[PDB]
C-alpha cells in the first residue's frame, strides 16, 4: 500500500508537494503565548493542556496559492490529535488534499524521515518543503529548504518562495531544476 490514494482528476496533472507544519508554517508551544493565533486543547495522559500556535507571516497567501499550483499534502512528524485541529484552522481553502502524521514517517537513526517513495507519486513530480533537512534525507533532490520559524514576524520566507514554486509547478520533472 501507498500513503496516498490515487490523486483526484483535478489533481493528477499537478506536482505533489509535501508541506511540513511545525516551524515551517506555524510554531506551537505549551508555554503560554499572549495574542496567539490559535489555542488548541491537547490531551496527554488524561490531562488536557493548552497549545499556543503562532502563524508564520504570509502563511495564508502561501497556502491559498500553493493549493492552486499543486496537489498539497500535509506531512508532519507530530500527532494527529494536535495536527488535525491546527490544519483545520489553517487550511481555509482546502489546499491540503491529504494529511500524514508521525505514524507515516520512517524512524531512521534517531530522526523522523518523510519517505517520499511511499507516497505513491512519480518522484519526478514530487517536492518536499520542510525546515529540517533530516526530514528529507532519502530524497534531498526533491527538497525546497526553508529556515525554521519560531516567532520572527519580520520573516517573509513563505512570501519569497512563491515565485520559485510558480516555476516548479509548471515543469514536467522537478529534477530538471533541482538537478537530477
Amino acid at each position: 500500500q501507498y500513503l496516498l490514494p490515487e490523486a483526484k482528476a483535478q489533481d493528477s496533472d499537478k506536482i505533489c508537494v509535501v508541506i511540513n507544519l511545525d516551524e515551517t508554517l506555524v510554531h506551537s508551544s505549551f508555554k503560554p503565548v499572549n495574542n496567539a493565533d490559535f489555542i488548541i486543547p491537547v490531551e496527554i495522559d488524561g490531562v488536557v493542556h493548552q497549545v499556543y500556535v503562532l502563524k508564520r507571516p504570509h502563511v495564508d497567501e502561501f497556502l491559498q496559492r500553493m493549493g492552486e499550483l499543486f496537489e498539497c499534502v500535509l506531512f508532519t512528524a507530530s500527532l494527529a490529535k494536535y495536527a488535525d485541529p491546527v490544519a483545520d484552522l489553517l487550511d481555509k481553502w482546502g489546499a491540503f488534499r491529504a494529511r500524514l502524521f508521525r505514524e507515516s514517517c520512517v524512524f531512521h537513526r534517531g530522526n523522523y524521515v518523510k519517505d517520499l517513495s511511499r507516497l505513491g507519486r512519480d518522484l519526478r513530480r514530487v517536492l518536499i518543503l520542510d525546515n529540517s533537512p533530516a526530514s528529507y534525507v532519502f530524497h534531498p533532490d526533491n527538497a525546497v529548504p526553508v529556515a525554521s520559524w519560531f516567532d520572527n514576524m519580520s520573516d517573509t520566507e513563505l512570501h519569497d518562495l512563491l515565485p520559485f514554486f510558480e516555476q516548479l509547478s509548471r515543469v514536467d520533472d522537478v529534477y530538471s531544476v533541482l538537478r537530477q
Partner: peptide, 6 residues
C-alpha cells in the same frame, strides 16, 4: 509538536 527525536 513535531519532535527531532521521540
Amino acid at each position: 509538536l513535531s519532535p527531532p527525536s521521540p
